[PDB]
């Protein structure tokens, strides 16, 4: 997260850390007690998932869990066309008993529109080029589909939307993929991709457009 700050501890209780050999490679979002959304480009043959976390380096905070997940499924149209349909569902090997610090979040029942006020969180790169230990949070605003399609020419697809791009240079970055973009209090997107470097003036980040996938998600959950 570029130009954010430490999140208030446990204020984003749906945040999931995806780690391998205790090293984070992506985040995800808890959407049901047994189900974590993430970017399809974060797919692995298995996962260790940190839930209820604030710090990655600290001792087990009260309420935190490290849970295994051995099953996941990418959207059938992922990367067709390139970068599009960037979501997958990870099924936890055990359902989590939701608690004060581990909670699911619902997906928005409305698609993004320019001006929507959002928050993105993650453990990805900071403005200073370092990786944080503590979960970071920053505010970004949705821009219009036309802005997104111009900026991300030639690869804009309706499975994507854009947020950020302000003169404030607030953005997601490497390591934030799969994490939540919460707009008006609902899960609106997952961190997906952007231009390098992150945090350029006038260049928003790109997020998976979850309002387009609610039927696929729930069909998969219920199968």
């Amino acid at each position: 997260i570029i130009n954010g700050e430490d999140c208030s501890p446990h204020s984003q209780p749906w945040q999931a850390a995806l780690v391998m050999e205790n090293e984070l490679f992506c985040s995800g979002v808890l959407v049901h007690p047994q189900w974590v959304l993430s970017a399809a480009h974060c797919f692995q043959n298995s996962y260790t998932i940190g839930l209820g976390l604030h710090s990655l380096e600290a001792d087990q905070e009260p309420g935190s869990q490290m849970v295994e997940a051995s099953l996941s499924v990418r959207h059938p149209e992922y990367n067709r066309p390139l970068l599009a349909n960037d979501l997958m569902l990870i099924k936890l090997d055990e359902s989590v008993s939701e608690s004060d610090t581990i909670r699911s979040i619902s997906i928005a029942s409305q698609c993004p529109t320019a001006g929507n006020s959002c928050l993105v969180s993650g453990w990805g790169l900071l403005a200073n080029g370092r990786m944080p230990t503590v979960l970071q949070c920053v505010n970004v605003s949705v821009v219009s589909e036309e802005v997104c399609s111009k900026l991300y020419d030639p690869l804009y697809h309706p499975s994507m939307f854009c947020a950020g791009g302000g003169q404030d240079q607030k953005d997601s970055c490497n390591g934030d993929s799969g994490g939540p973009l919460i707009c008006n209090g609902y899960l609106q997107g997952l961190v997906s991709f952007g231009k390098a470097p992150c945090g350029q003036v006038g260049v928003p980040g790109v997020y998976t457009n979850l309002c387009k996938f609610t039927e696929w998600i729930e069909k998969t959950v219920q199968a």
Binding site: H41, G124, N174, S177, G178, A196, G205
Partner: peptide, 14 residues
């Protein structure tokens, strides 16, 4: 120039 924002990221020629 586009990169999928995992760490390490997945970057493309554009």
């Amino acid at each position: 120039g586009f990169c999928q924002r995992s760490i390490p990221p997945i970057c493309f020629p554009n």
